[PDB]
Design a protein around this ligand. Structure first.
Ligand SMILES: [Fe+3]
Ligand SMILES: [Fe+3]
Lengths: 336, 309
C-alpha cells in the first residue's frame, strides 16, 4: 500500500497555506470558498498533488495515507464535548480547509442534510451520551467494517479521514478484495443481481418530513428501492479487478439461492481475513476508496476530558449532479 | 446566457501557456500529460477558471462561451482534407491542449475507441468524401448511460459565422402531468452504429430525470420511440418535443470562441453550410467530458484508458 511521507518543508508549506486560507475566508458558509477549492488545492506541494492524482487514476489500491502534517495542537485546542453548540468555524478550521482541498483533488465534497447539521466536514470524537452507539461519535462499541452507504446509488466514492489527534494510537480497520482468493464461479455470481442491500435507517423516507410534493419527489428513488426491493450485485466494473459494495449488516442473501449464499460466504471470508489495522496518527490523512475498500473502527476507552481522539471526515463524490433529485437546490451539496 | 470575454492579456497568457505545454509534452498519447492536466489547468488565468467553475456548479445554463482566444492562423495552417491517416499531433496542437485543459476543469476527457481513430480531440470540418438537408438536434449519445456530461467546442475558424443550434428546456410550457410521465421509464432510445459485450438489455428508460422542478434531459428524437399502447407517454413526448424545438437557439462559435455545452441541460445540432473545400473552411475541435471516468470502467479495455469500446 503506497503512502506519502511529507518532509518538514512540505509540512510547513501545507500548514502555512491552510492558515492563510483560514484567514482569508470566513467559513464554509462562503460559496466562493467552495468555488475556489480546486484552484486553491493547486497551491499544495507538487509531490502531494501528483501523488493523489496517481492514486485516483491508477484505480488499483483502495486506500492511501499522507503522513507528517503539522497539526498545531496549541491552536487546535481541546477535543470538544459535543459538535452541537460549537462556534463555527473552530480554531481547527485550517485542518478542515486542508481536507476540503484534498477533496477537490479527488472530486467534490458532499454531505447528508440530516448529519451533523449538514456540515461538509464531519467531526469524529467521543461523546458521552453516544457511548453505547456504533458510529463515529462512539468509543466503547466496535464499528464493524463496511462500504459506506452500500445500498445508496449516490454513496461516497472516496472518504477522507484526517487525524487531528489520536494519543492512544487507535487504529482504523480497512480491507480490500484479494481477487485471487475467490473461484471464478463465485466472481460470476457476485457480479449478478442476486442480493438485497437494505437501506440504513437514516436514509428511510419515513424518517424525513412527509410534507409537500417538493420533498416527496426527493426520496422517490429510495422509496422505490424500499418498495420494489430490487436485487443487485456485490461486485461490479471490471471482472478482472472489480469494485465492491459490501456491508454485511444490511446485505440479505435470498434463502433459495444456494449459489448466492456460497459466494457471499467466500467473499465475506476473504475480506474479513484481509482486514488491516491502519493507525491514523496525529497529522495523518487517510484516503479510502469506497468502491475498493471497506472500513471500520476498533473499540476504545474514551476519557471525555478534551484529550480524546479526534478525526475530521469529508465524503467525496465524483459526480455531484448525479444526485440532483435528492438535493433541494442545484447549489446545495447536501443530500436529503 | 453568461459568457466570458478575454482581455488581450488573458488571451496572451493563454496562448503562451498553450505553446509552452505543446513543446513540453509529446501528444495526448503522453500519460504524464493526462496525469498533469488539472494541475496544468490551474496556470490558466484565474478569472477563466473561476468562470468555468461557476458554470459547472451553478447547474443553471445549457451552454456558455469563452470568447477572444488568440488562435494564430499562420501556425494553425490550412483546414485539412480528412482526419483519417493524418499524423498526430499537427501544428494546431496548442489549441487541442487548451480544450484538454478546460475539460480537466470540468471533469475528465474521454473518447470513443471506434470514432476518429480513438483520438481524445475530435476534428469537425467539411469533407468532400463524406458529402434537402433536415435540421436535427440531439442530446449526445442520449441512449448511452456513460454519455458525455459536457461537450467542448473550440472554433479554430468560422469565416462565414456558421452557427450551432442549442436548446434548453422551458418547464413553464409543460403541464405537471406530462412531466411526471416523461420522468417514468416508458421510452426506448435506440443505439448507434458509429470480451466485447456491454450490449446490455437497453430497455425503456425515462426522458426527464433529476429535479422535477428543474429537470435534466436525454432527448434524441430520431432514435426515440414510445410503446404504441402507452398513449399518455406519447402525448407527453410530443409536448416536450414541441417545447424543445420551439425554444432552439442559434449560437455562433466564431474564431477564438470555445463553446461549452451541458449535455444534460441542452440539446445541440449542426446547421448546413456551403463549404469552399480549399483550406479556409470552418474548423472546430471537440472534446468529450465525463464527470466520472470510473463509472464507465466495464466498457474500458484497461484502467488507464479513457476510450470506451
Ligand atoms: Fe461508516
Ligand atoms: Fe453530436
Amino acid at each position: 500500500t503506497p503512502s506519502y511521507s511529507l518532509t518538514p518543508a512540505e509540512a510547513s508549506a501545507v500548514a502555512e497555506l491552510t492558515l492563510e486560507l483560514a484567514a482569508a475566508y470566513g467559513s464554509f458558509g462562503d460559496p466562493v470558498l467552495l468555488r475556489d477549492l480546486p484552484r486553491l488545492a493547486a497551491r499544495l506541494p507538487e509531490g502531494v498533488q501528483d501523488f493523489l492524482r496517481e492514486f485516483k487514476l491508477a484505480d488499483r489500491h483502495g486506500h492511501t495515507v499522507i503522513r507528517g502534517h503539522d497539526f498545531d495542537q496549541r491552536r487546535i485546542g481541546p477535543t470538544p464535548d459535543h459538535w452541537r453548540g460549537r462556534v463555527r468555524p473552530g480554531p481547527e478550521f485550517p485542518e478542515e480547509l486542508l481536507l476540503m482541498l484534498y477533496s477537490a483533488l479527488l472530486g467534490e465534497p458532499f454531505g447528508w442534510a440530516t448529519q451533523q447539521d449538514g456540515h461538509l466536514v464531519h467531526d469524529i470524537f467521543p461523546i458521552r451520551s453516544h457511548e453505547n452507539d456504533q458510529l463515529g461519535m462512539g468509543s466503547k462499541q466496535l464499528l464493524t467494517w463496511h462500504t459506506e452507504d452500500a445500498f445508496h446509488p449516490y454513496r461516497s466514492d472516496y472518504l477522507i479521514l484526517g487525524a487531528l489527534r489520536n494519543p492512544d494510537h487507535v487504529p482504523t480497520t480497512v480491507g480490500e478484495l484479494d481477487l485471487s482468493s475467490l473461484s471464478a464461479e463465485d466472481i460470476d455470481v457476485l457480479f449478478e443481481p442476486r442480493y438485497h442491500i437494505a437501506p440504513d435507517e437514516s436514509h428511510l423516507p419515513k424518517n424525513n418530513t412527509i410534507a409537500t410534493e417538493e420533498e416527496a419527489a426527493r426520496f422517490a428513488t429510495i422509496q422505490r428501492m424500499i418498495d420494489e426491493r430490487p436485487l443487485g450485485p456485490l461486485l461490479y466494473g471490471s471482472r478482472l479487478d472489480p469494485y465492491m459494495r459490501l456491508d454485511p449488516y444490511f446485505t440479505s442473501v435470498p434463502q433459495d439461492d444456494t449459489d448466492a449464499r456460497r459466494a457471499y460466504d467466500a467473499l465475506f471470508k476473504v475480506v474479513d481475513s484481509g482486514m488491516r489495522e491502519v493507525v491514523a496518527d496525529q497529522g495523518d490523512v487517510l484516503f479510502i476508496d469506497n468502491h475498493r475498500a471497506v472500513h471500520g473502527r476498533l473499540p476504545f476507552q474514551a476519557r471525555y476530558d478534551g484529550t480524546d481522539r479526534w478525526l475530521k471526515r469529508v465524503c467525496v463524490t465524483s459526480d455531484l449532479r448525479r444526485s440532483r433529485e435528492m438535493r433541494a437546490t442545484s447549489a446545495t451539496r447536501l443530500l436529503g
